[PDB]
Scaffold this active site. Sequence first.
Site, PDB file in Angstrom:
ATOM      1  N   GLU A   1      -9.509   0.309   4.402  1.00 33.51           N
ATOM      2  CA  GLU A   1      -9.056  -1.009   3.935  1.00 33.51           C
ATOM      3  C   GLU A   1      -9.154  -2.100   4.933  1.00 33.51           C
ATOM      4  OE1 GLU A   1      -5.192  -0.584   2.108  1.00 33.51           O
ATOM      5  OE2 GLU A   1      -5.995   0.966   0.676  1.00 33.51           O
TER       6      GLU A   1
ATOM      7  N   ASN B   1     -13.526   3.806   3.954  1.00 29.92           N
ATOM      8  CA  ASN B   1     -12.817   3.946   2.617  1.00 29.92           C
ATOM      9  C   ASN B   1     -12.169   2.660   2.258  1.00 29.92           C
ATOM     10  OD1 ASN B   1     -12.036   6.006   0.569  1.00 29.92           O
ATOM     11  ND2 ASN B   1      -9.929   5.522   1.265  1.00 29.92           N
TER      12      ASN B   1
ATOM     13  N   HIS C   1      -8.996   3.021  -7.707  1.00 30.44           N
ATOM     14  CA  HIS C   1      -7.695   2.738  -8.361  1.00 30.44           C
ATOM     15  C   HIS C   1      -7.924   1.689  -9.469  1.00 30.44           C
ATOM     16  CE1 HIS C   1      -5.465   5.184  -5.570  1.00 30.44           C
ATOM     17  NE2 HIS C   1      -6.013   4.531  -4.557  1.00 30.44           N
TER      18      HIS C   1
ATOM     19  N   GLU D   1     -10.028   8.314  -4.529  1.00 27.75           N
ATOM     20  CA  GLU D   1      -8.586   8.216  -4.914  1.00 27.75           C
ATOM     21  C   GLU D   1      -8.474   7.759  -6.393  1.00 27.75           C
ATOM     22  OE1 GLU D   1      -6.463   5.641  -2.076  1.00 27.75           O
ATOM     23  OE2 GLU D   1      -7.614   6.469  -0.332  1.00 27.75           O
TER      24      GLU D   1
ATOM     25  N   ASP E   1      -7.760   7.037 -10.022  1.00 27.41           N
ATOM     26  CA  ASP E   1      -6.624   7.026 -10.982  1.00 27.41           C
ATOM     27  C   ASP E   1      -6.884   5.760 -11.890  1.00 27.41           C
ATOM     28  OD1 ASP E   1      -5.428   5.093  -9.301  1.00 27.41           O
ATOM     29  OD2 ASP E   1      -3.936   6.477  -8.561  1.00 27.41           O
TER      30      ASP E   1
HETATM   31  O1  LIG Z   1      -1.761  -0.912  -0.792  1.00 30.45           O
HETATM   32  C1  LIG Z   1      -3.032  -0.822  -1.429  1.00 30.45           C
HETATM   33  C2  LIG Z   1      -2.988  -1.529  -2.749  1.00 30.45           C
HETATM   34  O2  LIG Z   1      -2.865  -2.892  -2.481  1.00 30.45           O
HETATM   35  C3  LIG Z   1      -4.291  -1.317  -3.481  1.00 30.45           C
HETATM   36  O3  LIG Z   1      -4.082  -2.180  -4.667  1.00 30.45           O
HETATM   37  C4  LIG Z   1      -5.191  -2.608  -5.464  1.00 30.45           C
HETATM   38  C5  LIG Z   1      -5.084  -4.046  -5.930  1.00 30.45           C
HETATM   39  O4  LIG Z   1      -6.304  -4.392  -6.572  1.00 30.45           O
HETATM   40  C6  LIG Z   1      -6.400  -3.585  -7.732  1.00 30.45           C
HETATM   41  O5  LIG Z   1      -7.367  -4.021  -8.685  1.00 30.45           O
HETATM   42  C7  LIG Z   1      -6.656  -2.177  -7.298  1.00 30.45           C
HETATM   43  O6  LIG Z   1      -6.709  -1.477  -8.482  1.00 30.45           O
HETATM   44  C8  LIG Z   1      -5.403  -1.703  -6.641  1.00 30.45           C
HETATM   45  O7  LIG Z   1      -5.468  -0.429  -6.061  1.00 30.45           O
HETATM   46  O8  LIG Z   1      -4.510   0.019  -3.774  1.00 30.45           O
HETATM   47  C9  LIG Z   1      -4.566   0.840  -2.603  1.00 30.45           C
HETATM   48  C10 LIG Z   1      -3.326   0.629  -1.724  1.00 30.45           C
HETATM   49  O9  LIG Z   1      -3.281   1.387  -0.492  1.00 30.45           O
END
Ligand SMILES: O[C@@H]1[C@@H](O)[C@H](O[C@@H]2CO[C@@H](O)[C@H](O)[C@H]2O)OC[C@H]1O
Length: 319
Positions: free
Chosen positions: A131, A172, A208, A238, A240
């Site tokens: 990230e 990642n 996600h 990851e 989901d």
């Molecule tokens: O803390 C992190 C979250 O901020 C991250 O959130 C994302 C926000 O944008 C969405 O469209 C994504 O689906 C969603 O995951 O997810 C990972 C986490 O570590």
Amino acid sequence: AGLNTAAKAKGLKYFGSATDNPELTDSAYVAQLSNTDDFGQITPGNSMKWDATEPSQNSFSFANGDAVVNLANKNGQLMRCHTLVWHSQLPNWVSSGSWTNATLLAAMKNHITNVVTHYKGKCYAWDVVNEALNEDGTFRNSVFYQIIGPAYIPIAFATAAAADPDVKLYYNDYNIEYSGAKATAAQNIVKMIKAYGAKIDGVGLQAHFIVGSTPSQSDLTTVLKGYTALGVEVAYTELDIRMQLPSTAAKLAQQSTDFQGVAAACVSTTGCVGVTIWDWTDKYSWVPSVFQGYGAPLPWDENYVKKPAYDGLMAGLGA
Ligand SMILES: O[C@@H]1[C@@H](O)[C@H](O[C@@H]2CO[C@@H](O)[C@H](O)[C@H]2O)OC[C@H]1O
Ligand SMILES: *[C@@H]1O[C@H](CO)[C@@H](O)[C@H](O)[C@H]1NC(C)=O
């Protein structure tokens, strides 16, 4: 017979799942996590993070990490190892430190070397940096970026490669799975690491997603091939697909097609080595505590019963 057998019949290395140490005392949970028809690979959700593994500077702590490795080893499952450098789940000593580039670099490199060496030979892959990007593709203003600048990223890779030259090294991130500035910036990280001379083997796509708002199979595929073109492998790390509650038959059915496209996008891209879901039962999903009003994200429900998304996955895997 199941997700992992189907995946491997298509040439993927695995279908797998994340877990966490508190769940390993739940015998019904553990029986299905240990079912290699469904899961050939495991990721620790929390016990390989920096807070868990280096709670005080130079004072490492591996018991919780190792207990998840021991479960995978018992089952003959692969491991993905997660994560060495990330802005979240840092212990106090990192986030409160008065650092210079030299002092933070030394602490970062020592954390990577210790934790990578510890798990040498035990991991299929490491998520070396997690990230690192903002949504616009700029660099996230973490402590590492503020203090070290962009070079933190290749230095992290190089340090991991020195410690374990066999393990696949991944970058990642989330929202790098669909076309856009962030994905482009993720390709640029790959390029930058290699321009430094450091090794990177893969891109980790967190995946996600949201039910009814999931990237299409065509765009997922375009984006995976945008990475594989660069000479790296890819994986969904990851996965989901959270739904806006309450759960309904129609939302469960949309969820199925949404998961189906993810599997099928990976099959369709040579170089997509696998899919990991972020846990496998709704009972233990991280989603509801983070995304208020969302939940039911996974292929099994909170009673450990398969949902239609399990069949969507099987279908996308051509099984
Ligand atoms: O803390 C992190 C979250 O901020 C991250 O959130 C994302 C926000 O944008 C969405 O469209 C994504 O689906 C969603 O995951 O997810 C990972 C986490 O570590
Ligand atoms: C930190 O040091 C490394 C050399 O070890 C260098 O690559 C990088 O630019 C430095 N960063 C800053 C902000 O001074």
